Design an enzyme around this catalytic site. Structure first.
Site, short mmCIF file in Angstrom:
data_model
loop_
_atom_site.label_atom_id
_atom_site.label_comp_id
_atom_site.label_asym_id
_atom_site.label_seq_id
_atom_site.Cartn_x
_atom_site.Cartn_y
_atom_site.Cartn_z
CG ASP A 70 84.17 64.26 8.84
OD1 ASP A 70 85.10 64.73 9.52
OD2 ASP A 70 83.00 64.70 8.90
CG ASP A 76 79.23 62.05 13.46
OD1 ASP A 76 80.29 62.70 13.55
OD2 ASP A 76 79.02 61.00 14.10
CG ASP A 117 81.14 67.08 13.73
OD1 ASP A 117 82.33 67.44 13.59
OD2 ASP A 117 80.79 65.88 13.88
MG LIG Z 1 82.19 64.01 14.31
#
Ligand SMILES: [Mg+2]
Ligand SMILES: C/C=C(/C)C(=O)O[C@H]1C(C)=C2[C@H]([C@@H]1OC(=O)CCCCCCC)[C@@](C)(OC(C)=O)C[C@H](OC(=O)CCC)[C@@]1(O)[C@H]2OC(=O)[C@@]1(C)O
Ligand SMILES: Nc1ncnc2c1ncn2[C@@H]1O[C@H](COP(=O)(O)OP(=O)(O)OP(=O)(O)O)[C@@H](O)[C@H]1O
Ligand SMILES: [Mg+2]
Ligand code: NA
EC number: 7.2.2.10
Length: 994
Positions: free
Chosen positions: A351, A703, A707
């Site tokens: 990310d 996170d 996910d």
């Molecule tokens: Mg996330």
């Protein structure tokens, strides 16, 4: 009702046949509970301690050991004599190791926690409903709630099921949905239907998700789904259906066991074939029982010699040690076996926000309109210094400080930034730095306002806590914020309705200050502001504005741009409905363009380098970001992913573009793509799936609970240290600092740990090969046992275990990161190496068997019966050779076994040195290269003498201190092993290049 968000409240009530003011009747509750089940995720399997203890004996090698423990037990029972002082030692030792093995196995399971059970932490014990059988609300157990009942939630409550909001009792309802949508900012909910049947969770403005929390307000709603049918429930099912494969090493290790099992049985068949001549012996004479015991004795020793009993402990020690090392570098490895996999990482999906960038927002540029006159047009562009949230910095005109107030256009720019904002600043006296309150994007605006100071306020008088929100408060005293139309992904803008502070009985002076993504905001502007005047939005000015924006956001500045505007004549207050967010865009029309602010979320200082390490290491990096495609690509070029001028048309995709591709094209897109922008909820999982279909070892970051599925599916799920406990529990590694560079550093550590592991694994298995040869040569020559089970075990667990562990500290090669990812299928031993250990094994086998036979013959201390051949007999039932005497039990002497064992230990201390490097000679890479290894060898030799002199031990191991002459003979047979391997290495270096 899976599609509740797109249904009106009346339609949801009609679907379940429930009344909003009474709730479900008891018959409804009965039938609904019957049809939908209880509102809870299923319970994990009730694995009993016994079932857990039985699994500790499922492995093929542990079962073979168990079998040999049984034979051993039987032999130590079907024996005759007063050897009661010691006989059941052998079986007790084997069994003890197996017991210690099982204990550990159970110990780990008890301390292990799974991500699925971590989700249940998000289900509240209770909830509140309204049911026909009672006038007032009643709190019941959450698991008793069902689809259809009317529920009530208020600030502080943990949402009990997925609910369609029917009525908001408080002035507004705010929900903390971070765990499911990632939105760390509490969002406002409404009740109107959301038309798109396929809206992602983030856009279901009328739903409350189970596991989420009410941040503010009170509301009534109807339960749409419960149990596994909620968003969190579906996440639990995906996770449960995800099967994670065994690591590469675990797979090779299992293959080794199978083959070893195959080889052991074949050797038993060989020892039988080589002695089939025994069928040609007379039926009478000789003890058939003493002959059988012999064969079962070599079977037990063969099994013990073939299994590297100490390998698992050596592996686990190297892993625990390396893991502690990695922690010092902010990489918290949760699964020891994952260190290997990390080293094989082929693709890293990361990310952007907070990992590739700092997520510390700062306005760098901004511009307002300067002049508009026919086709002529000019802008007023500025720069701002200070990358922190601190009001420290200044505005600039050609890097030359200017006063913002000298430009009214900037006064209004700053007014919009201060008012159309929910964030603020707060000087944390403790840390000593101005921290943000709210989102980074808006706080950057708050910080910009303090630097601009368009009213020349005296802030150099305030403290550090008063300087924070100084210039903002001034603008707040000038305009009264009536209400605010929240931001939403559809219109990508936000506005606030305001009225002057000091104003009498007047109905003119109100303004709406708007902020949002440029394209949509600029399309809704019919005017352009110039200082204090206003003129009509024309094409010349519009293209001019959009061109700078394109340049700032797609050029090397990679700035996140926001267009600021104001509706000069907003609709009358009575004519606006604040509950229908679907009308907010209409209210933000006929605007006056004021300016643009461009802010930067800077890459971590180390990211640039780490990305380059990946390129050298042959590791592909894929960025996943919420940025639009243009800015995402721009940022990829900036940090190194893409070349500054390289074509990336088919190497970057938005979620939308990706979904429009057919399955075949999506797979292909994944093998070459390095950038994914505006990615759907399930894309991470689909991306991992496609990457695995190319055998890529994938590392993926995440996170929140949303996910978890992808983290679990990736070979290396990577969670943020600042993320949810669920994401962490579903990951192999946690970044204590959220930094992308922490991943790269862990991959390198992984490559280094494994290289060392490869050496001590080949080292230990090598010795087992030699031990099997010894037991085979001895059983094929009908010779007296040279090495017995208890001795072999001490060598494989202790003597050799120390050097093995030390090998785990071998210095790493300097070109660790200049090599491509190691292929998972890469065998540990094959080709020329297989021959070398074939030669070393044959050597060790003959050296030990030889040393013992030596004592039995050409040795003074023992029966100097040279060429007598112990092969001849071991029954003494006929006594042909010994023509006269009164003794024949010297075939069980400890001296000969001590010669074999000493040779084994000595050759192994030497082979450990030959293990420092696969192909380098000890002349190029000296033994002292690894001091731990020299130290370990010294400790192992001391332990050897220990069991030779401390009386209790030599009796238990059947050993006898060696003479100085005998020792010298040991060195004569052992030391030369170094020369043998030295020659084999030489051949590998000079005649095996290509
Ligand atoms: Mg996330
Ligand atoms: C542990 C001790 C021994 C003697 C054993 O039987 O190991 C075999 C075996 C199971 C393999 C072999 C051994 O095979 C032989 O040595 C041939 C038979 C000689 C016996 C003579 C008696 C009459 C390894 C040990 O031989 C050498 C010489 O290095 C190499 C390697 O093992 C590895 O790479 C280790 C994987 C963790 C494996 O071929 C492996 O099988 C596989 O599937 C592999 C790919 O694994
Ligand atoms: N508070 C805000 N007020 C007005 N416009 C905003 C605000 N926050 C963001 N925007 C604008 O709307 C666009 C979309 O923002 P959005 O929050 O959906 O994406 P993002 O913040 O870049 O990434 P993420 O999806 O992770 O939040 C942004 O690129 C920006 O132009
Ligand atoms: Mg955002
Ligand atoms: Na995983």
């Amino acid at each position: 009702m899976e599609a509740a968000h797109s249904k009106s409240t009346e339609e949801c009530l009609a679907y379940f046949g429930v009344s909003e003011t009474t709730g479900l009747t008891p018959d409804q509750v009965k039938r609904h509970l019957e049809k939908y089940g209880h509102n809870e995720l299923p319970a994990e399997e009730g694995k009993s301690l016994w079932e857990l203890v039985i699994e500790q004996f499922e492995d093929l090698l542990v079962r073979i050991l168990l079998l040999a423990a049984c034979i051993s037990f039987v032999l130590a029972w079907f024996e005759e004599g007063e050897e009661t002082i010691t006989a059941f030692v052998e079986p007790f030792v084997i069994l003890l190791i197996l017991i210690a093995n099982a204990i550990v196995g159970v110990w780990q399971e008890r301390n292990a926690e799974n991500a699925i059970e971590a989700l249940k932490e998000y289900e509240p014990e209770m909830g509140k409903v309204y049911r026909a059988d009672r006038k007032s609300v009643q709190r019941i157990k959450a698991r008793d709630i069902v689809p259809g009942d009317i529920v009530e939630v208020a600030v502080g409550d943990k949402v009990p099921a997925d609910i369609r909001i029917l009525s908001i009792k408080s002035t507004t309802l705010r929900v903390d949905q971070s765990i499911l949508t990632g939105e760390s900012v509490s969002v406002i909910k409404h009740t109107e239907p959301v038309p798109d049947p396929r809206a992602v969770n983030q856009d279901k403005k009328n739903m409350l998700f189970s596991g989420t929390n009410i941040a503010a307000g009170k509301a009534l709603g109807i339960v749409a789904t419960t149990g596994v049918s909620t968003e969190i429930g579906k996440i639990r099912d995906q996770m449960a259906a995800t099967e994670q494969d065994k690591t590469p090493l675990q797979q090779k290790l299992d293959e080794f066991g199978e083959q070893l099992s195959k080889v052991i049985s074949l050797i038993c068949v060989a020892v039988w074939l080589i002695n089939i001549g025994h069928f040609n012996d007379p039926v009478h004479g000789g003890s058939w029982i003493r002959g059988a015991i012999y064969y079962f004795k070599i079977a037990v020793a063969l099994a013990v010699a073939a299994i590297p009993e100490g390998l698992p402990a050596v592996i686990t020690t190297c892993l625990a040690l390396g893991t502690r090392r990695m922690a010092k570098k902010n990489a918290i490895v949760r699964s020891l076996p994952s260190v290997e996999t990390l080293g094989c990482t082929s693709v890293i999906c990361s990310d952007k926000t907070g990992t590739l960038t700092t997520n510390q927002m700062s306005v760098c540029k901004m511009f307002i309109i300067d002049k508009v006159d026919g086709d002529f047009c000019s802008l007023n562009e500025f720069s701002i210094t200070g990358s922190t949230y601190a009001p420290e910095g200044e505005v600039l005109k050609n890097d030359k400080p200017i006063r913002s107030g000298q430009f009214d256009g900037l006064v209004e720019l700053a007014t919009i930034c201060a008012l159309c904002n929910d964030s603020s600043l707060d000087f944390n006296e403790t840390k000593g730095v101005y921290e943000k309150v709210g989102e980074a994007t808006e706080t950057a605006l708050t910080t910009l306002v303090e630097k601009m100071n368009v009213f020349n306020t005296e802030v150099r008088n305030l403290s550090k806590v008063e300087r924070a929100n100084a210039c903002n408060s001034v603008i707040r005293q000038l305009m009264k914020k009536e209400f605010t139309l929240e931001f939403s992904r559809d219109r990508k803008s936000m506005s606030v309705y305001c009225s002057p502070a000091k104003s009498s009985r007047a109905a003119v002076g109100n303004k709406m200050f708007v902020k949002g993504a440029p394209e949509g905001v600029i399309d809704r502007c019919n005017y352009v502001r110039v200082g204090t005047t206003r003129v009509p939005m024309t094409g010349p000015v519009k293209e001019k504005i959009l061109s700078v924006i394109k340049e700032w956001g797609t050029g090397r500045d990679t700035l996140r741009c926001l267009a600021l505007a104001t509706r000069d004549t907003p609709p009358k207050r009575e004519e606006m409905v604040l509950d229908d967010s679907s009308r907010f865009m209409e209210y933000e029309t006929d605007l006056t363009f004021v300016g643009v602010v461009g802010m930067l979320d800077p890459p971590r200082k180390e990211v640039m380098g780490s990305i380059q390490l990946c390129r050298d290491a042959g590791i592909r990096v894929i960025m996943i970001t919420g940025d639009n495609k243009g800015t995402a690509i721009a940022i990829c070029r900036r940090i190194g992913i893409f070349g500054e001028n390289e074509e990336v048309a088919d190497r970057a995709y938005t979620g939308r573009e990706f979904d429009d591709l057919p399955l075949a094209e999506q797979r292909e897109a994944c093998r070459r793509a390095c950038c994914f922008a505006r990615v759907e909820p399930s894309h991470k999982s689909k991306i991992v799936e496609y990457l695995q279909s190319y055998d890529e070892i994938t590392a993926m970051t995440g996170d929140g609970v949303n996910d978890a599925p992808a983290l679990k599916k990736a070979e290396i799920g990577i969670a943020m240290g600042s993320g949810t406990a669920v994401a962490k529990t579903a990951s192999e590694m946690v970044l204590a600092d959220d930094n992308f560079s922490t991943i790269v550093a862990a991959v390198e550590e992984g490559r280094a740990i494994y290289n060392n592991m490869k050496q001590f694994i080949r080292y230990l298995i090598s010795s087992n090969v030699g031990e099997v040869v010894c037991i085979f040569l001895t059983a094929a020559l009908g010779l007296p046992e040279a090495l017995i089970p208890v001795q072999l075990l001490w060598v494989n667990l202790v003597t050799d275990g120390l050097p093995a562990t030390a090998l785990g500290f071998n210095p790493p090669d300097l070109d660790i990161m200049d090599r491509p990812p190691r292929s998972p299928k890469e065998p540990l031993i094959s080709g020329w190496l297989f021959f070398r250990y074939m030669a070393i094994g044959g050597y060790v086998g003959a050296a030990t068997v030889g040393a013992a036979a030596w004592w039995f013959m050409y040795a003074e201390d023992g029966p100097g019966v040279t060429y007598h051949q112990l092969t001849h007999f071991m029954q003494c039932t006929e006594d042909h050779p010994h023509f006269e005497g009164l003794d024949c039990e010297i075939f069980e002497a400890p001296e000969p076994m001590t010669m074999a064992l000493s040779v084994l230990v000595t050759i192994e201390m030497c082979n450990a040195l030959n293990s420092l490097s696969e192909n380098q000679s000890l002349m190029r890479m000296p033994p002292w290269v690894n001091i731990w290894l020299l130290g370990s060898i010294c400790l192992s030799m001391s332990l050897h003498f220990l069991i030779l002199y401390v009386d209790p031990l030599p009796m238990i191991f059947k050993l006898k201190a060696l003479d100085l002459t005998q020792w010298l003979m040991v060195l004569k047979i052992s030391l030369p092993v170094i020369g043998l391997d030295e020659i084999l290495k030489f051949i590998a270096r000079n005649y095996l290049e290509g």
